[model samples]
Target: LMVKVLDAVRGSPAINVAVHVFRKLTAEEEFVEGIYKVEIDTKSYWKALGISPFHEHAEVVFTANDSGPRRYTIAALLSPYSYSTTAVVT
Candidate 1:
Protein backbone atom coordinates (compact mmCIF):
# COMPACT_ATOMS: atom_id res chain seq x y z
CA LEU A 1 0.00 0.00 0.00
CA MET A 2 1.10 3.52 -0.74
CA VAL A 3 0.28 6.44 1.55
CA LYS A 4 0.81 10.11 0.88
CA VAL A 5 0.91 13.02 3.32
CA LEU A 6 0.69 16.75 2.64
CA ASP A 7 1.14 19.74 4.93
CA ALA A 8 0.65 23.39 4.07
CA VAL A 9 1.40 26.46 6.11
CA ARG A 10 -1.65 28.58 6.99
CA GLY A 11 -1.91 31.78 4.95
CA SER A 12 1.26 30.86 3.10
CA PRO A 13 2.07 29.17 -0.19
CA ALA A 14 4.62 26.81 1.31
CA ILE A 15 3.83 23.14 1.52
CA ASN A 16 5.53 19.95 2.68
CA VAL A 17 4.91 16.52 1.21
CA ALA A 18 5.88 12.89 1.77
CA VAL A 19 5.10 9.36 0.66
CA HIS A 20 5.29 5.98 2.38
CA VAL A 21 4.86 2.39 1.29
CA PHE A 22 3.82 -0.68 3.28
CA ARG A 23 4.26 -4.26 2.14
CA LYS A 24 2.22 -6.86 3.96
CA LEU A 25 3.79 -10.12 4.91
CA THR A 26 2.54 -13.33 3.29
CA ALA A 27 3.25 -15.76 6.10
CA GLU A 28 0.73 -15.61 8.92
CA GLU A 29 3.10 -17.21 11.37
CA GLU A 30 5.63 -14.45 10.72
CA PHE A 31 3.28 -11.98 12.30
CA VAL A 32 4.67 -12.80 15.71
CA GLU A 33 8.10 -13.65 14.39
CA GLY A 34 10.06 -10.39 14.55
CA ILE A 35 10.30 -6.75 13.65
CA TYR A 36 9.41 -5.53 10.18
CA LYS A 37 10.79 -2.68 8.11
CA VAL A 38 9.03 0.54 7.09
CA GLU A 39 10.26 2.95 4.46
CA ILE A 40 9.48 6.68 3.89
CA ASP A 41 10.30 9.34 1.32
CA THR A 42 10.04 13.06 2.13
CA LYS A 43 10.34 16.53 0.57
CA SER A 44 10.06 19.80 2.42
CA TYR A 45 10.58 23.16 0.75
CA TRP A 46 9.62 24.92 3.94
CA LYS A 47 12.71 23.58 5.64
CA ALA A 48 14.82 25.57 3.23
CA LEU A 49 13.33 28.78 4.64
CA GLY A 50 14.09 27.82 8.24
CA ILE A 51 10.54 26.62 8.88
CA SER A 52 10.38 23.17 10.35
CA PRO A 53 8.52 20.53 8.46
CA PHE A 54 5.03 20.13 9.91
CA HIS A 55 4.49 16.44 9.28
CA GLU A 56 6.05 13.11 10.29
CA HIS A 57 5.48 9.39 9.72
CA ALA A 58 5.27 6.62 12.31
CA GLU A 59 4.80 2.93 11.50
CA VAL A 60 4.17 -0.20 13.49
CA VAL A 61 4.32 -3.79 12.29
CA PHE A 62 2.72 -6.65 14.12
CA THR A 63 3.34 -10.34 13.54
CA ALA A 64 1.30 -13.24 14.84
CA ASN A 65 3.48 -16.31 15.28
CA ASP A 66 2.97 -19.44 17.33
CA SER A 67 4.10 -17.68 20.48
CA GLY A 68 2.02 -14.50 20.37
CA PRO A 69 1.76 -11.04 18.89
CA ARG A 70 5.05 -9.26 18.26
CA ARG A 71 5.15 -5.58 17.38
CA TYR A 72 7.80 -3.13 16.25
CA THR A 73 7.37 0.62 16.03
CA ILE A 74 9.44 3.10 14.05
CA ALA A 75 9.38 6.88 13.82
CA ALA A 76 10.84 8.70 10.85
CA LEU A 77 11.59 12.36 11.53
CA LEU A 78 10.90 14.78 8.70
CA SER A 79 12.49 18.11 9.65
CA PRO A 80 12.93 20.30 12.73
CA TYR A 81 9.37 20.24 14.08
CA SER A 82 9.10 16.43 14.16
CA TYR A 83 5.66 15.56 12.79
CA SER A 84 4.55 11.92 12.45
CA THR A 85 1.86 9.31 11.75
CA THR A 86 1.30 5.85 13.21
CA ALA A 87 0.11 2.55 11.78
CA VAL A 88 -0.77 -0.80 13.36
CA VAL A 89 -0.91 -4.13 11.53
CA THR A 90 -2.03 -7.48 12.82
Candidate 2:
Protein backbone atom coordinates (compact mmCIF):
# COMPACT_ATOMS: atom_id res chain seq x y z
CA LEU A 1 0.00 0.00 0.00
CA MET A 2 1.12 3.57 -0.75
CA VAL A 3 -0.13 6.79 0.83
CA LYS A 4 0.92 10.37 0.24
CA VAL A 5 1.65 12.92 2.95
CA LEU A 6 0.70 16.57 2.88
CA ASP A 7 2.58 19.68 3.92
CA ALA A 8 1.66 21.64 6.98
CA VAL A 9 0.84 24.70 4.92
CA ARG A 10 -0.23 24.78 1.34
CA GLY A 11 2.41 25.26 -1.40
CA SER A 12 5.13 23.87 0.83
CA PRO A 13 7.47 20.93 0.42
CA ALA A 14 6.34 17.46 1.53
CA ILE A 15 9.35 15.38 0.74
CA ASN A 16 11.03 12.88 3.01
CA VAL A 17 8.80 13.53 5.99
CA ALA A 18 9.13 11.08 8.85
CA VAL A 19 6.41 8.46 8.84
CA HIS A 20 5.82 6.07 11.72
CA VAL A 21 3.79 2.91 11.33
CA PHE A 22 2.61 0.69 14.18
CA ARG A 23 1.66 -2.86 13.33
CA LYS A 24 -0.15 -5.47 15.36
CA LEU A 25 1.31 -8.92 15.56
CA THR A 26 -0.16 -11.94 17.35
CA ALA A 27 0.34 -11.05 21.00
CA GLU A 28 2.07 -7.72 20.82
CA GLU A 29 2.11 -4.55 18.76
CA GLU A 30 5.17 -3.88 16.60
CA PHE A 31 6.42 -0.71 14.93
CA VAL A 32 7.57 -0.29 11.35
CA GLU A 33 8.97 3.06 10.32
CA GLY A 34 8.94 4.74 6.90
CA ILE A 35 8.62 8.03 5.03
CA TYR A 36 5.87 9.81 3.03
CA LYS A 37 5.65 9.08 -0.66
CA VAL A 38 3.50 8.05 -3.62
CA GLU A 39 4.85 4.48 -3.72
CA ILE A 40 6.03 2.48 -0.69
CA ASP A 41 6.25 -1.27 -0.11
CA THR A 42 7.26 -1.98 3.49
CA LYS A 43 7.40 -5.70 4.11
CA SER A 44 10.89 -6.30 5.47
CA TYR A 45 9.62 -6.06 9.02
CA TRP A 46 7.24 -8.93 8.54
CA LYS A 47 9.88 -10.86 6.62
CA ALA A 48 12.43 -10.32 9.39
CA LEU A 49 9.97 -11.23 12.13
CA GLY A 50 8.83 -14.33 10.31
CA ILE A 51 5.29 -13.20 9.78
CA SER A 52 2.96 -14.39 7.05
CA PRO A 53 2.09 -12.83 3.73
CA PHE A 54 -1.45 -11.76 4.57
CA HIS A 55 -3.54 -8.94 5.91
CA GLU A 56 -2.71 -7.25 9.23
CA HIS A 57 -3.80 -4.31 11.36
CA ALA A 58 -1.61 -1.22 11.39
CA GLU A 59 -1.52 2.48 12.29
CA VAL A 60 0.30 5.03 10.14
CA VAL A 61 1.35 8.44 11.49
CA PHE A 62 3.06 11.01 9.27
CA THR A 63 1.76 14.45 10.20
CA ALA A 64 2.79 16.31 13.34
CA ASN A 65 3.81 19.65 14.82
CA ASP A 66 4.86 21.35 18.07
CA SER A 67 2.15 23.77 17.13
CA GLY A 68 -0.29 20.94 16.57
CA PRO A 69 0.91 18.59 19.37
CA ARG A 70 -0.55 15.56 17.58
CA ARG A 71 0.61 13.35 14.74
CA TYR A 72 -1.66 11.74 12.16
CA THR A 73 -1.57 8.78 9.77
CA ILE A 74 -0.93 8.13 6.06
CA ALA A 75 -0.28 4.56 4.73
CA ALA A 76 2.86 2.87 3.35
CA LEU A 77 4.23 -0.51 2.33
CA LEU A 78 7.79 -0.78 0.93
CA SER A 79 7.04 -1.73 -2.69
CA PRO A 80 9.49 1.15 -3.55
CA TYR A 81 9.76 4.88 -2.65
CA SER A 82 8.57 7.66 -4.93
CA TYR A 83 6.45 10.72 -4.24
CA SER A 84 4.15 12.56 -6.62
CA THR A 85 4.45 16.16 -7.79
CA THR A 86 2.86 18.68 -10.11
CA ALA A 87 6.15 20.41 -10.80
CA VAL A 88 8.17 19.40 -13.80
CA VAL A 89 11.65 17.89 -13.51
CA THR A 90 13.20 21.23 -14.33
Candidate 3:
Protein backbone atom coordinates (compact mmCIF):
# COMPACT_ATOMS: atom_id res chain seq x y z
CA LEU A 1 0.00 0.00 0.00
CA MET A 2 2.33 2.69 -1.26
CA VAL A 3 1.99 5.54 -3.75
CA LYS A 4 3.48 8.83 -4.87
CA VAL A 5 1.61 11.81 -6.30
CA LEU A 6 3.28 13.25 -9.36
CA ASP A 7 0.86 15.91 -10.60
CA ALA A 8 -2.73 17.08 -10.60
CA VAL A 9 -4.62 16.93 -13.88
CA ARG A 10 -8.04 18.41 -13.14
CA GLY A 11 -10.18 19.89 -10.40
CA SER A 12 -13.64 20.98 -9.08
CA PRO A 13 -14.69 17.32 -9.49
CA ALA A 14 -11.61 15.30 -10.24
CA ILE A 15 -12.24 12.18 -12.27
CA ASN A 16 -8.72 10.85 -12.23
CA VAL A 17 -5.35 11.17 -10.48
CA ALA A 18 -1.71 10.15 -10.21
CA VAL A 19 -0.19 9.42 -6.80
CA HIS A 20 2.43 8.19 -4.29
CA VAL A 21 2.24 8.69 -0.49
CA PHE A 22 -0.91 10.55 -1.38
CA ARG A 23 -2.17 13.65 0.39
CA LYS A 24 -5.87 12.94 0.14
CA LEU A 25 -8.60 10.97 1.79
CA THR A 26 -11.50 9.13 0.15
CA ALA A 27 -13.83 11.96 -0.91
CA GLU A 28 -12.51 14.89 0.99
CA GLU A 29 -10.24 17.37 -0.78
CA GLU A 30 -8.95 20.10 1.49
CA PHE A 31 -5.61 21.66 2.30
CA VAL A 32 -5.34 21.80 6.06
CA GLU A 33 -2.41 22.80 8.20
CA GLY A 34 -0.15 20.09 9.60
CA ILE A 35 -1.82 17.61 7.29
CA TYR A 36 0.77 14.99 6.52
CA LYS A 37 0.83 11.56 4.85
CA VAL A 38 -1.77 9.18 6.23
CA GLU A 39 -1.59 5.46 6.78
CA ILE A 40 -4.88 3.65 7.30
CA ASP A 41 -4.25 -0.01 8.13
CA THR A 42 -7.76 -1.36 7.79
CA LYS A 43 -9.97 -3.04 5.26
CA SER A 44 -12.64 -0.38 5.72
CA TYR A 45 -10.11 2.26 4.78
CA TRP A 46 -9.26 0.60 1.48
CA LYS A 47 -12.95 0.05 0.77
CA ALA A 48 -13.48 3.78 0.91
CA LEU A 49 -10.61 4.56 -1.46
CA GLY A 50 -12.21 2.50 -4.24
CA ILE A 51 -15.72 3.87 -4.11
CA SER A 52 -17.48 7.04 -5.14
CA PRO A 53 -20.81 8.33 -3.82
CA PHE A 54 -21.90 10.25 -6.88
CA HIS A 55 -23.69 9.68 -10.14
CA GLU A 56 -21.79 11.53 -12.82
CA HIS A 57 -20.95 8.69 -15.18
CA ALA A 58 -21.94 10.73 -18.22
CA GLU A 59 -18.46 11.36 -19.60
CA VAL A 60 -16.04 10.74 -22.41
CA VAL A 61 -12.52 9.31 -22.69
CA PHE A 62 -9.86 8.76 -25.28
CA THR A 63 -7.97 5.45 -25.17
CA ALA A 64 -5.01 4.66 -27.38
CA ASN A 65 -2.94 1.59 -28.16
CA ASP A 66 0.08 0.80 -30.29
CA SER A 67 -0.12 -2.96 -30.62
CA GLY A 68 1.17 -3.23 -34.14
CA PRO A 69 4.38 -2.24 -35.86
CA ARG A 70 4.27 1.47 -36.48
CA ARG A 71 0.51 1.16 -36.04
CA TYR A 72 -1.79 2.47 -33.38
CA THR A 73 -5.44 3.04 -32.70
CA ILE A 74 -7.23 5.64 -30.65
CA ALA A 75 -10.73 4.98 -29.54
CA ALA A 76 -13.13 7.29 -27.77
CA LEU A 77 -15.55 5.92 -25.24
CA LEU A 78 -18.43 8.37 -24.96
CA SER A 79 -19.85 7.50 -21.59
CA PRO A 80 -20.33 8.97 -18.17
CA TYR A 81 -17.74 8.43 -15.44
CA SER A 82 -18.78 5.63 -13.15
CA TYR A 83 -16.56 4.92 -10.21
CA SER A 84 -16.84 1.37 -8.99
CA THR A 85 -19.04 1.64 -5.94
CA THR A 86 -17.95 -1.79 -4.69
CA ALA A 87 -14.44 -2.04 -6.12
CA VAL A 88 -10.97 -0.68 -5.57
CA VAL A 89 -9.63 1.88 -8.02
CA THR A 90 -6.23 1.91 -6.37
Candidate 4:
Protein backbone atom coordinates (compact mmCIF):
# COMPACT_ATOMS: atom_id res chain seq x y z
CA LEU A 1 0.00 0.00 0.00
CA MET A 2 1.15 3.52 -0.81
CA VAL A 3 -0.06 6.69 0.85
CA LYS A 4 0.26 10.10 -0.76
CA VAL A 5 -0.74 13.38 0.81
CA LEU A 6 -0.73 16.79 -0.87
CA ASP A 7 -0.96 20.25 0.62
CA ALA A 8 -3.56 22.21 -1.27
CA VAL A 9 -2.56 25.55 0.17
CA ARG A 10 1.09 25.32 -0.77
CA GLY A 11 0.76 23.12 -3.86
CA SER A 12 3.38 20.63 -2.77
CA PRO A 13 3.68 17.22 -1.29
CA ALA A 14 2.66 16.89 2.32
CA ILE A 15 5.98 15.94 3.82
CA ASN A 16 6.35 14.26 7.19
CA VAL A 17 2.66 13.43 7.35
CA ALA A 18 1.85 10.64 9.74
CA VAL A 19 -0.19 7.72 8.45
CA HIS A 20 -1.64 4.73 10.25
CA VAL A 21 -3.01 1.50 8.83
CA PHE A 22 -5.45 -0.59 10.84
CA ARG A 23 -6.83 -4.05 10.34
CA LYS A 24 -7.79 -7.11 12.37
CA LEU A 25 -5.01 -9.54 11.75
CA THR A 26 -3.05 -12.13 13.59
CA ALA A 27 -0.05 -9.88 12.80
CA GLU A 28 0.51 -9.82 9.04
CA GLU A 29 2.40 -7.67 6.57
CA GLU A 30 1.10 -9.19 3.28
CA PHE A 31 -2.36 -8.20 2.26
CA VAL A 32 -5.37 -10.09 3.63
CA GLU A 33 -8.93 -10.30 2.41
CA GLY A 34 -10.80 -8.23 4.98
CA ILE A 35 -11.81 -4.78 6.09
CA TYR A 36 -9.10 -2.18 6.43
CA LYS A 37 -8.85 1.36 7.67
CA VAL A 38 -6.27 3.99 6.74
CA GLU A 39 -5.82 6.92 9.05
CA ILE A 40 -4.18 10.22 8.02
CA ASP A 41 -3.20 12.69 10.70
CA THR A 42 -4.40 15.90 9.14
CA LYS A 43 -4.52 17.84 12.40
CA SER A 44 -0.87 17.34 13.10
CA TYR A 45 -0.06 18.08 9.52
CA TRP A 46 -1.88 21.38 9.74
CA LYS A 47 -0.56 22.19 13.17
CA ALA A 48 2.95 21.95 11.78
CA LEU A 49 1.95 24.66 9.36
CA GLY A 50 0.56 26.81 12.20
CA ILE A 51 -3.02 26.66 10.95
CA SER A 52 -6.17 26.04 12.94
CA PRO A 53 -7.73 22.91 11.58
CA PHE A 54 -11.35 21.81 11.57
CA HIS A 55 -10.99 18.09 11.05
CA GLU A 56 -8.66 16.14 13.24
CA HIS A 57 -8.12 13.20 10.96
CA ALA A 58 -9.00 11.66 7.63
CA GLU A 59 -10.16 8.06 7.88
CA VAL A 60 -10.73 5.80 4.90
CA VAL A 61 -12.34 2.41 5.33
CA PHE A 62 -12.32 -0.11 2.52
CA THR A 63 -12.60 -3.81 1.87
CA ALA A 64 -10.08 -5.87 -0.05
CA ASN A 65 -11.40 -9.13 -1.43
CA ASP A 66 -9.45 -9.59 -4.61
CA SER A 67 -8.41 -13.12 -5.33
CA GLY A 68 -5.08 -11.95 -6.73
CA PRO A 69 -2.37 -9.51 -5.83
CA ARG A 70 -3.30 -5.84 -5.77
CA ARG A 71 -1.63 -2.55 -5.10
CA TYR A 72 -3.36 0.50 -3.76
CA THR A 73 -2.54 4.15 -3.29
CA ILE A 74 -4.53 6.29 -0.88
CA ALA A 75 -4.32 9.88 -2.02
CA ALA A 76 -5.51 12.90 -0.09
CA LEU A 77 -5.59 16.60 -0.97
CA LEU A 78 -6.07 18.69 2.11
CA SER A 79 -6.97 22.18 3.17
CA PRO A 80 -8.18 23.66 6.45
CA TYR A 81 -11.82 22.50 6.62
CA SER A 82 -12.00 20.31 3.54
CA TYR A 83 -10.22 17.29 2.17
CA SER A 84 -10.60 15.22 -0.97
CA THR A 85 -9.75 11.54 -0.99
CA THR A 86 -9.37 8.98 -3.72
CA ALA A 87 -8.11 5.43 -4.15
CA VAL A 88 -6.05 4.10 -7.00
CA VAL A 89 -5.72 0.36 -7.54
CA THR A 90 -3.33 -1.43 -9.80
Candidate 5:
Protein backbone atom coordinates (compact mmCIF):
# COMPACT_ATOMS: atom_id res chain seq x y z
CA LEU A 1 0.00 0.00 0.00
CA MET A 2 1.04 3.60 -0.70
CA VAL A 3 -0.12 6.69 1.22
CA LYS A 4 0.15 10.44 0.67
CA VAL A 5 -0.90 12.96 3.32
CA LEU A 6 -2.33 16.44 2.94
CA ASP A 7 -2.32 19.66 4.87
CA ALA A 8 -4.37 20.03 8.03
CA VAL A 9 -7.62 21.97 7.94
CA ARG A 10 -9.47 23.98 10.53
CA GLY A 11 -11.79 21.13 11.54
CA SER A 12 -9.57 18.15 10.63
CA PRO A 13 -5.93 17.94 11.58
CA ALA A 14 -5.12 14.40 10.47
CA ILE A 15 -5.62 11.95 7.61
CA ASN A 16 -6.79 8.33 7.75
CA VAL A 17 -5.26 5.71 5.42
CA ALA A 18 -6.07 2.00 5.01
CA VAL A 19 -4.58 -0.93 3.13
CA HIS A 20 -5.58 -4.57 2.58
CA VAL A 21 -3.71 -7.70 1.54
CA PHE A 22 -5.03 -11.16 0.62
CA ARG A 23 -4.77 -14.05 -1.76
CA LYS A 24 -7.48 -15.71 -3.84
CA LEU A 25 -7.66 -19.39 -2.99
CA THR A 26 -8.04 -21.63 -6.06
CA ALA A 27 -7.91 -25.08 -4.53
CA GLU A 28 -11.01 -27.16 -3.88
CA GLU A 29 -9.53 -29.05 -0.96
CA GLU A 30 -11.22 -28.63 2.37
CA PHE A 31 -7.98 -27.86 4.13
CA VAL A 32 -4.75 -26.08 3.34
CA GLU A 33 -1.68 -24.85 5.16
CA GLY A 34 0.50 -21.86 4.41
CA ILE A 35 2.79 -19.36 6.05
CA TYR A 36 2.36 -15.61 5.73
CA LYS A 37 4.25 -12.51 6.83
CA VAL A 38 3.73 -8.72 6.65
CA GLU A 39 6.04 -5.75 7.00
CA ILE A 40 5.67 -1.94 6.73
CA ASP A 41 8.04 0.88 5.79
CA THR A 42 7.61 4.66 5.80
CA LYS A 43 9.28 7.47 3.86
CA SER A 44 8.94 11.22 4.08
CA TYR A 45 9.84 13.93 1.61
CA TRP A 46 9.40 16.65 4.19
CA LYS A 47 12.04 15.02 6.35
CA ALA A 48 14.58 15.82 3.68
CA LEU A 49 13.45 19.43 3.90
CA GLY A 50 14.32 19.52 7.63
CA ILE A 51 10.96 18.33 8.88
CA SER A 52 10.79 16.25 12.07
CA PRO A 53 9.86 12.58 12.00
CA PHE A 54 6.92 12.98 14.38
CA HIS A 55 4.53 11.57 11.82
CA GLU A 56 2.00 9.07 13.18
CA HIS A 57 2.06 5.60 11.58
CA ALA A 58 0.71 2.11 12.34
CA GLU A 59 0.73 -1.45 10.96
CA VAL A 60 -0.90 -4.88 11.58
CA VAL A 61 -0.37 -8.46 10.32
CA PHE A 62 -2.51 -11.62 10.19
CA THR A 63 -2.35 -15.17 8.80
CA ALA A 64 -4.70 -18.09 8.20
CA ASN A 65 -4.83 -21.50 6.57
CA ASP A 66 -8.08 -22.46 4.85
CA SER A 67 -9.50 -23.74 1.59
CA GLY A 68 -11.09 -20.43 0.63
CA PRO A 69 -9.91 -16.95 -0.01
CA ARG A 70 -9.87 -14.40 2.79
CA ARG A 71 -9.41 -10.65 3.13
CA TYR A 72 -7.40 -8.70 5.66
CA THR A 73 -7.38 -4.98 6.38
CA ILE A 74 -4.72 -2.80 7.96
CA ALA A 75 -5.25 0.74 9.11
CA ALA A 76 -2.88 3.62 9.80
CA LEU A 77 -2.82 7.30 10.71
CA LEU A 78 -0.14 9.42 9.09
CA SER A 79 1.19 12.93 9.15
CA PRO A 80 1.16 15.28 6.20
CA TYR A 81 3.43 14.21 3.32
CA SER A 82 4.08 10.64 4.34
CA TYR A 83 3.91 7.29 2.49
CA SER A 84 3.75 3.59 3.44
CA THR A 85 3.75 0.15 1.85
CA THR A 86 2.80 -3.43 2.89
CA ALA A 87 4.08 -6.84 1.78
CA VAL A 88 2.47 -10.27 2.26
CA VAL A 89 3.35 -13.90 1.69
CA THR A 90 1.45 -17.19 1.50
Candidate 6:
Protein backbone atom coordinates (compact mmCIF):
# COMPACT_ATOMS: atom_id res chain seq x y z
CA LEU A 1 0.00 0.00 0.00
CA MET A 2 1.23 3.52 -0.83
CA VAL A 3 -0.13 7.06 -0.70
CA LYS A 4 0.82 10.33 -2.38
CA VAL A 5 -0.67 13.78 -1.85
CA LEU A 6 -0.18 16.86 -4.00
CA ASP A 7 -1.21 20.44 -3.45
CA ALA A 8 -2.70 22.17 -6.47
CA VAL A 9 -2.36 25.67 -5.05
CA ARG A 10 1.33 25.38 -4.25
CA GLY A 11 2.25 22.83 -6.94
CA SER A 12 4.17 20.68 -4.47
CA PRO A 13 3.88 17.64 -2.34
CA ALA A 14 1.54 18.37 0.51
CA ILE A 15 3.39 18.10 3.79
CA ASN A 16 2.12 16.43 6.95
CA VAL A 17 -0.70 14.62 5.20
CA ALA A 18 -2.04 12.03 7.57
CA VAL A 19 -3.31 8.69 6.28
CA HIS A 20 -5.14 6.10 8.29
CA VAL A 21 -5.45 2.49 7.19
CA PHE A 22 -8.16 0.36 8.68
CA ARG A 23 -8.41 -3.35 7.95
CA LYS A 24 -9.29 -6.34 9.94
CA LEU A 25 -4.36 -8.84 10.71
CA THR A 26 -1.07 -10.36 10.00
CA ALA A 27 1.43 -13.29 10.30
CA GLU A 28 3.44 -12.29 7.36
CA GLU A 29 -0.03 -12.02 5.95
CA GLU A 30 -0.67 -11.81 2.30
CA PHE A 31 -3.25 -9.26 1.22
CA VAL A 32 -6.54 -10.73 2.25
CA GLU A 33 -9.64 -10.53 0.15
CA GLY A 34 -11.64 -8.03 2.09
CA ILE A 35 -12.76 -4.44 2.41
CA TYR A 36 -10.32 -1.70 3.29
CA LYS A 37 -10.63 1.90 4.29
CA VAL A 38 -8.09 4.65 3.76
CA GLU A 39 -8.82 7.91 5.48
CA ILE A 40 -6.91 11.01 4.44
CA ASP A 41 -6.78 13.90 6.85
CA THR A 42 -7.45 16.70 4.41
CA LYS A 43 -8.90 18.98 7.04
CA SER A 44 -5.77 18.96 9.14
CA TYR A 45 -3.59 19.33 6.08
CA TRP A 46 -5.34 22.43 4.80
CA LYS A 47 -5.74 23.76 8.29
CA ALA A 48 -1.98 23.61 8.68
CA LEU A 49 -1.67 25.83 5.66
CA GLY A 50 -4.22 28.24 7.21
CA ILE A 51 -7.01 27.47 4.79
CA SER A 52 -10.63 26.70 5.49
CA PRO A 53 -11.61 23.71 3.41
CA PHE A 54 -15.11 22.52 2.58
CA HIS A 55 -14.62 18.82 2.96
CA GLU A 56 -13.76 17.50 6.35
CA HIS A 57 -11.76 14.55 5.11
CA ALA A 58 -11.17 12.32 2.15
CA GLU A 59 -12.17 8.73 2.73
CA VAL A 60 -11.46 5.91 0.32
CA VAL A 61 -13.08 2.55 0.77
CA PHE A 62 -12.23 -0.34 -1.52
CA THR A 63 -12.12 -4.06 -1.86
CA ALA A 64 -9.01 -6.15 -2.50
CA ASN A 65 -9.80 -9.35 -4.31
CA ASP A 66 -7.30 -9.83 -7.07
CA SER A 67 -6.06 -13.33 -7.69
CA GLY A 68 -2.65 -12.19 -8.84
CA PRO A 69 -0.14 -10.26 -6.82
CA ARG A 70 -0.71 -6.53 -6.98
CA ARG A 71 0.04 -3.23 -5.31
CA TYR A 72 -2.06 -0.16 -4.65
CA THR A 73 -1.08 3.46 -4.99
CA ILE A 74 -3.58 5.99 -3.69
CA ALA A 75 -3.01 9.50 -4.98
CA ALA A 76 -4.77 12.69 -3.99
CA LEU A 77 -4.84 16.13 -5.60
CA LEU A 78 -6.14 18.83 -3.34
CA SER A 79 -7.30 22.41 -3.14
CA PRO A 80 -9.42 24.26 -0.52
CA TYR A 81 -12.91 23.18 -1.65
CA SER A 82 -12.08 20.55 -4.18
CA TYR A 83 -10.13 17.28 -4.15
CA SER A 84 -9.55 14.40 -6.49
CA THR A 85 -8.26 10.91 -5.86
CA THR A 86 -7.33 7.86 -7.84
CA ALA A 87 -6.22 4.33 -7.12
CA VAL A 88 -3.43 2.92 -9.21
CA VAL A 89 -3.37 -0.85 -8.92
CA THR A 90 -0.59 -3.01 -10.27
Q: Write the per-residue lDDT of candidate 5 for residues 24-70, one digit (tens) a residue.
A: 62336654454343445533433243354435673635464446675
Give the per-residue lDDT of model 2 (tens digit) for 44-74. Answer: 3323445553357856565633454654455
Candidate 6 backbone clash number: 0
The weakest ten consecutive residues by lDDT in model 5 span: 41-50
Off by over 4 Å in 2: 1-8, 25-90
Query: lDDT tens digits, residues 7-61, model 1?
Result: 3345433334444445761235534442344355433432243344435674746
The runs of at least 3 residues in candidate 3 whose Cα sits more than 4 Å from the true structure, single-residue gaps closed, are 1-49, 68-90
TM-score, candidate 3, is 0.15
**TM-score of each model, paired residue for residue:** 0.16, 0.16, 0.15, 0.15, 0.14, 0.15
Better of 3 and 6 by lDDT: 6
lDDT of 6 by residue, 1-90 (tens): 766655345554434455557667224555644334445532332224334534678585645443667554545534323355546656
Pairs clashing in candidate 5? none
**Residue 4 alpha-carbon offset, candidate 4, angstroms:** 6.1
lDDT of each: 0.44, 0.46, 0.42, 0.48, 0.46, 0.48
Report the lDDT tens digits of candidate 3 across residue range 1-90. 755564464544424442335444545465454433444332332245334554486474546544545533333233224442433333
Candidate 4 lands at a TM-score of 0.15
Model 1: pairs clashing at backbone N, Cα or C within 3 Å: 31-63, 31-64, 32-63, 32-64, 32-65, 56-83, 56-84, 58-85
- Quote model 1's TM-score: 0.16
